[PDB]
Write a protein that binds this DNA or RNA. Sequence first.
DNA 1: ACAGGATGTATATATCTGACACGTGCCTGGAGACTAGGGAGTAATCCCCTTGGCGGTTAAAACGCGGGGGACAGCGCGTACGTGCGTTTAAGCGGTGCTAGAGCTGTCTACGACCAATTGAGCGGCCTCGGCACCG
DNA 2: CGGTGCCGAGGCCGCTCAATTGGTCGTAGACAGCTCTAGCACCGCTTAAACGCACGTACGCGCTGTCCCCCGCGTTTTAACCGCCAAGGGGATTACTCCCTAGTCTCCAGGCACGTGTCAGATATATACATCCTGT
Lengths: 95, 103, 80, 86, 95, 95, 95, 97
Amino acid sequence: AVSRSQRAGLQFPVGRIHRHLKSRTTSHGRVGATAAVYSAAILEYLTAEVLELAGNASKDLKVKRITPRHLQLAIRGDEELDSLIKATIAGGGVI
Amino acid sequence: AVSRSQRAGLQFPVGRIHRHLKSRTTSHGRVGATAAVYSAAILEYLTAEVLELAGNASKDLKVKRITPRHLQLAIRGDEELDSLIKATIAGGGVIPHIHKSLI
Amino acid sequence: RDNIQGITKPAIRRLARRGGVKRISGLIYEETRGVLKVFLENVIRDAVTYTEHAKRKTVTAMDVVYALKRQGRTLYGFGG
Amino acid sequence: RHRKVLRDNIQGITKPAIRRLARRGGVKRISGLIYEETRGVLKVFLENVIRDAVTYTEHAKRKTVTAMDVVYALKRQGRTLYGFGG
Amino acid sequence: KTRKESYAIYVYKVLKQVHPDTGISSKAMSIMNSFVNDVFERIAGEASRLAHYNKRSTITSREIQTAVRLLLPGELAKHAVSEGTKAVTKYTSAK
Amino acid sequence: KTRKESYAIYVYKVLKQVHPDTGISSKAMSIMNSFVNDVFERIAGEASRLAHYNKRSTITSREIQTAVRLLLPGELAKHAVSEGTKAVTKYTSAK
Amino acid sequence: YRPGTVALREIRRYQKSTELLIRKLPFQRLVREIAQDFKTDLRFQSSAVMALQEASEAYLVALFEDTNLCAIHAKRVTIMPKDIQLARRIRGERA
Amino acid sequence: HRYRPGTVALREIRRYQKSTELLIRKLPFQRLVREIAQDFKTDLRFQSSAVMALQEASEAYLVALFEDTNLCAIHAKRVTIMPKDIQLARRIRGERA
DNA sequence: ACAGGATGTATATATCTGACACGTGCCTGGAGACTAGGGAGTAATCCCCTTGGCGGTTAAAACGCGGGGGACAGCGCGTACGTGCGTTTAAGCGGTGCTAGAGCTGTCTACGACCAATTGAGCGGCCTCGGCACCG
DNA sequence: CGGTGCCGAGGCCGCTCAATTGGTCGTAGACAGCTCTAGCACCGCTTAAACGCACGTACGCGCTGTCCCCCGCGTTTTAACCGCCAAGGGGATTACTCCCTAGTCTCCAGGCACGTGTCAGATATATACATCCTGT
């Protein structure tokens, strides 16, 4: 009952990520338990980066809630995430 | 005593295509029997179109042997095949294309 | 007024205003009518094929997201 | 036992070479300031492709870069190339 | 040394079917082999994605047919699905 | 009716970790959920492709690490691989 | 008054907000008319046509921004149909 | 006797368009590829086929870029290309710097 | 406005050699025969979300008029790239040799798949309250 | 800068099904060893191509009328928007059952390296013709 996510000191549900990675593989694909914590850490770092940029933009606009406009601003603002995320934010807007 | 390709009257290996599709199918997934036949037919028709275009292109240059230049000319000649093959042909070169204000 | 003509002049004008266009000519209206028609056609073909595969008769949002995801113009905010 | 720390090879793509490329490209006449900027874009393109290929061949634990890995790197950049490996 | 899988013989056979006299260089044969592998990879990936979308696990002829109606543009896709249905009917209506 | 899998709770947790006071709208939460699913899908697909390239069948931490060094651009990838190694070391150096 | 000021006012106003510009009902009628060809007597979730509207609006905005770059390249300040066709040729949609 | 200025250019257009063979000197390009490969990781070796394929993809991308810039410039009511045309074409396509 | 007239191009032949189509010996992956189980096809049932319609209501479209502005032929000039010439270098070829890492092959072991008994966290409801969306 | 209202979002239960730890195995990869194909480094020779430069001539850039035409306002007019009500098609479940495909055993034949003997196409060369460049 040690809750492996906390054993990695992470927030993401490493068991759920494990059974997710379990399916999207080749014919007899196996995943390693060491890989699930790695993907979980990757997702946690990326979400933390995007959300802290959005929160900085929100405190710029002085709003407690983060709106999709804040997400658009934070993503297109810093060049790195924009270069990663080529997507189109729903209801986001432009610069 | 017969092979599945001749059983369906095709020319692509149904067993090999079936093994590949079994080898790329979301580990707990399965592959239907007829699906390999369908995929083989699809690939056969695509190769038929490209090779016929290459032959018609080469026949206008009086060469019995098809070369990558003929592949690139046949692919970029047609529109929809050009929409399919978005890649680059090794050594294929470009099509002879001259614009308006170049004189 | 054909069904395409719902995309009228002030709509396309405000659209160009969002992009930062300072001044628009006359034929741009017909041009963008044709262009948007092409784009919606390209998306809706894929959406209808997905839905017809799923044995349904309702183009749900999930299939629109899938069709935009395949065409290199992915869109968040609707799940999938 | 590696030697020859390379330098100045960006001038390897010489001016008649880029001239010949644009002649194939369908360009009639060329202003003289092109050569530096096309050297730059060639540099950055080769940087990205070689970076991806090196990451591939380092993942396979190899001290050399095979052709198949370069083809894979070009595939992952939307500029896939036939003829060599797939 | 271990043999490598290819497609060259089948390309030669279908070429001789459509054009009885002409030939094909080895480099062009490798090009066609890579092109076949690319198209088949795209079709397999799209069919797997579609099967994962519709919560099914058995890629039958239906998802493959939808994949060729997806990837290839209009009349090419029409000829393709026609030949596919013809081939699968010839297969099923046999011994 | 059957519940649907999401990521919203973990996004909320990591948000409260990085920003203790701010909030996030439900629509922005759905946006972040879709973005997490997209990034994880890209990483899983790339890792599967890499494992199929190198003729192996067990996606360990190595192929995942190569996937994040592939997809994400430079310094973001550097921070990501650093956090990944840190998390996997914290996991391994435990009970 | 003078021409050249209300334009910039529109620039500022329509980039500050993020709400939908194309009015919903004629767009939905257009979508139904276009779907009338590829199948008969469809039905549409309102969320689906909302998503189509969002994506099409984002696409048209991107195209206008790019063709504005194209127009300002030729020292003009008014766009023209050849500019839009040039932008779509350079992106490569060739449609 | 002398040609009109530009006729030789169109002759070379026809020549280098109907040809197929490679267009950059092999050894300098290979040296440049190794030089760029240095800083990413040291002590790297290269298959000759790999450098050949890099040359193919390189010339393909540069030919596409040059053709597109020629389209841009011929739209711009000029005949000579210019570096801002290249920057414009790359900015349209999606690349940047 | 065709008349010379170098300057490049069809064209037919000759050669020539490396490429390739075809014939081999060999050999694992395709086929056929059977069985097991489980994924989905169909059948039925519920309910909800979609379409249809009505009626006000009112902001947005939409002609239309007018007035300034900018797109654009048209000159005109003043840098600069093409078209040569002679001159130098390093690309390429061909060898020649050196060595090291790619690629197999055989053991060994370790870690992840599988199965199960357990239990707690993640989600559906659900309440509730205060962050924000407007309004002097 | 306060007031009022709004319900969106955040915190709190019930519950149920997915993590999770314990025990087994077996197969996939780690790894040591051994080969040898192929990549790297000179060396010399040739020479085609890069390179410097001297003119000059097409043309990029700029300036100037100038007339089409596009933006701004003003009025009407029109069709979207909100709200609400009604019917029901189809989406979303559950429940059987059986069709179909994953396996295993046996077998052999289509397919794959390997050689080779013929020849198709590259290359060169010598004719028979387009084709630009002044020009009476």
